[PDB]
Subunit: 332 residues, 4 copies
């Protein structure tokens, strides 16, 4: 007479549920699943929705996650090619589209991914008009600009995963040189998540001790041992990892979960993520690139005004120019 009927007696009317913290991940490839597992691992969603054009793959992924439910704290995991499954998401993570082939610039993916975005972004906003969108697909800064224009969402609700990842890499490498935890090394990689990123040497410090003060040659061509190479390693890292295993995913998955945690827990932590920087540091157009931003439940609510050195501002502007040159010709 129905398992449930007999065993479970209702105290409240049957009625409507509605996820408080529903997250959607679009794209169930390497990056998508890594974000998904990291999100689940930290119990950040009470509902996880997945979307992809590959129906079988999408279903298999859902089922595999569902089978590990005993070990998780996410009561509902759903998956469909139709965006109606993403309704009422607080956060949508977009990792859908093509990735770099070996040695390929992220900037070379632009047209293919813009085509993808033009089609899926409107479906996303239709079903969650008040969500926050975390853009991850490459090139991430330009795609965040693209998402902003297509979605019609406010700036503080369209965020590029950006240099949160580059900065974690930088902090890891710095840590390795000093023999301490990356959380105790402070340093910011800003600008494009790509070849034109900028190391803010003037802010690199341990326990408040400015490394640039200790080594005024930090970041130059005349440095003993030997910073610039550290920034070069950050720049090259995706290519080196792609050459070895075909793609990257674990670090970006962790990076994404870290941003989500700040926002779903309303913490107001600072992260270098991609936002609209017109009017900052002499940038004249609607360029998106990473700066230290404050993240909480409203999304990206603030940017940190820094006192960048002239060479730092110069490299930032150069990064802004590289990006704007591509953005400026994007067609609608």
């Amino acid at each position: 007479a129905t398992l449930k009927e007999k065993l479970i007696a209702p105290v409240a009317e049957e009625e409507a549920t509605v996820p408080n913290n529903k997250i959607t991940v679009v794209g169930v490839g390497q990056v998508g699943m890594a974000c998904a597992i990291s999100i689940l691992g930290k119990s950040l969603a009470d509902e996880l929705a997945l979307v992809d054009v590959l129906e079988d793959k999408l279903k298999g992924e859902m089922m595999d996650l569902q089978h590990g439910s005993l070990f998780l704290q996410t009561p509902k995991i759903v998956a469909d090619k139709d965006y109606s499954v993403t309704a009422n998401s607080k956060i949508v993570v977009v990792t859908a589209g093509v990735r770099q082939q070996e040695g390929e610039s992220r900037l070379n993916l632009v047209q293919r991914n813009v085509n993808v975005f033009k089609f899926i972004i409107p479906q996303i906003v239709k079903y969650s008009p008040d969500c926050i969108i975390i853009v991850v697909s490459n090139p991430v800064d330009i795609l965040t600009y693209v998402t902003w224009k297509l979605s019609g969402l406010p700036k503080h609700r369209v965020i590029g995963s950006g240099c949160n990842l580059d900065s974690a890499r930088f902090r890891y490498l710095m840590a390795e040189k000093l023999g301490i935890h990356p959380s105790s090394c402070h340093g910011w990689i800003l600008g494009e998540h790509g070849d034109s990123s900028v190391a803010v040497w003037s802010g690199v410090n341990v326990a408040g001790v400015s490394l640039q003060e200790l080594n005024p040659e930090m970041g130059t061509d005349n440095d003993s041992e030997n910073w610039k190479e550290v920034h070069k390693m950050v720049v090259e890292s995706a290519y080196e990892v792609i050459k070895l295993k075909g793609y990257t995913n674990w670090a970006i998955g962790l990076s994404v979960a870290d941003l989500i945690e700040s926002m779903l827990k309303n913490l107001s932590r600072i992260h270098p993520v991609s936002t609209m920087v017109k009017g900052m540091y002499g940038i004249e157009n609607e360029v998106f690139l990473s700066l230290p931003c404050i993240l909480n439940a409203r999304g990206l609510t603030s940017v940190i005004n820094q006192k960048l050195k002239d060479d730092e501002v110069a490299q930032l502007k150069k990064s802004a120019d590289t990006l704007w040159d591509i953005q400026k010709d994007l067609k609608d």
Copy 2:
């Protein structure tokens, strides 16, 4: 031209957070702070409000928690004698009132505590019309009933901590006899939180093996395993600990946090908490007793139907009459 103005540039123009995962703990005594710290430890609240009539102690408890903020994930902690600080809480935990003296029964506190609740409950609902209330103060089953009536809330939104603690103690004691983790021990203490709780022997098992089937004398006075002594120990628990350190708090604090987790994570896990059992097991009055109940974001949405023996039913009935005998003379 403040520092904040210089350092921080608003992206989305202005802060103001949408009421969300806010929790209030009423009473900042041994139990109240134990609940507060456990709620804080598991990052269950994005805002924690404290209320007590002891203004000085209240402010100091508040400050001390705040001083720990670096190590926590709750961006806002506030406290006031006035209930306006509790506005828009999702969940309110009531631990205020008088407690048992060494030896004293929980029912000796009824009158004094009915007077406390007559004041506090209407304040809670006035400022948080949509909250879930968890009642901890003793006598707990009676006060859960008093809260239900004063609150005007539907039954699924009024939960008595009931036998959640009794059962935790029971599983701990069972675990000590077997040498395994209490989470691997299963057994249910239901009914009245104190003296008259019921041990449902038929459900005591490890890995699905019925210990009663293995030992049909389980629960009788002629049992080589002395299971009845275990239940007796669960019963004398409050007493022995009160005699030793003056009160109990850590275990109940942990148990309240566990209920909150099930709810804010929408888990639909089952806990032995106290609900309105009229029309169950032959009970014909409005009384709150513990049964295995399903907790989720809406609250306590259902109860598990069990096949109870005659003597178990009888105790439940006996508890219901005793409780009703007190409740029928409660005015206003």
Copy 3:
């Protein structure tokens, strides 16, 4: 006069950590990385070593994890084709080998995988003479036996993941029928990891209530609740997911991490993993099958004695003969 020399003043003269909570994952395929990321997510290792014959992929997996270090609590991650990087591990997880093709049985991989293990197992014990080994590779019960023999380790230090995953799936499926969290559902799938697993119907319960007692037709072909279809679904699981996405990894990855937690935290929780069952249930050969076992810091220290029905015993025996039929012809 390095920066490190200038910034950091040694207190206790010199670094060198005492081997402690080190874990090795052998194989960096779908399952291996899923285990790695889940182990990393729960901070189970103070050092993670990876080993695989695919040198390029191995290095890239290593780098990607390292890039995530800021978000983790594992200060050292290393990887090498050579087993010296695995020296002094407390726990070694073996997931290397060939996997099932869509449709293909787990036993079709025996020969190829026996050759893999003949090489890997002696390397593991040579570099970590005091480790605990968790076998994941298929066919898992057979390979657990092969590992026990090649390793020379006592039985409490060789654990086959066995039916830990089967049972997780089963609890998920039960939870889906009842609408509660799988942790509130109890039921044991024992015996052989694959096709021939056994559902112990007598132990399936919710809150201590026997569902079999409630539905004596549970498990037969004439059951309105279709419990046998549930078990059938647990059995077809690998198959359906493999057909959809090519392999399974997330659920097993989570389940391995859960076993490790029980062990490194010394919990003595009970899990359905595979141990040497000779002399149990009438089995007279050296074979590994899943039963409810207690895991703690020493490993798998005990097994739960159960009262099994004749048909359950018979399947267990039938599985033991089949396994033995393969194992008896294994040489060296």
Copy 4:
């Protein structure tokens, strides 16, 4: 015939356990229990031992914790006035002795607490000669010196909880002024955990932006709004909280757990804790006070060399002098 005997079948010989991560907390008053609950909350110990001269209180506390075991991951909690229960602790936390009465300097507790320490320290080292001792009792810097001399342990194994707490308070207050999470505000309070502590203004920063650069008057008498008062609030905080609730405990409990996490997880994170600073910043005697130190499994292995301003060095030396003046007359 013995519950266990029948139900649980041994796989490994009965034999010896031994905690990997055993922690002892000495003193079960406000501070001791707060450290205990925070340690348990984060699953940092596989064994927790408690010691106090108050036998009944000590037992009650043990039992209360034990009753919440279902919600914890610490299989063994023991308590006794005899130090033999503390054997093989990796970490011993000493919170035993007298605390400040209202308005009383921590320095006024010195003789009474030195008497306590002279008696208990030798018992502690007898039973755990290789432990790391975290000193918390006041005055904490002087008591760390005292512990070092009495215990005969190496410097990197005797650590004063020190200014980890003052700095968290500083970061909280700073955060409140800027509207962000304390984890995103960086600033160090060093020297005595007491009235002569030192704010290192030159290291105060957000996202690497030096606040002193933005406000060169930071910390002086001619400051717009208005740092010095922030340091004053940190200095006064214990007195204000003591005046309100009688003592402090939650923040210090969290602070202590944070240090333990760094060490038991071997993270090498930086914390401002109390260590022996002879030969640093012109300090000529064996003074203990807080500086940023690197913590991992070996204890306190490194100190960070800072580039302190002349006024900062001056205040540091003044703090060192205040302390040494008391240390110098300590009698053995």
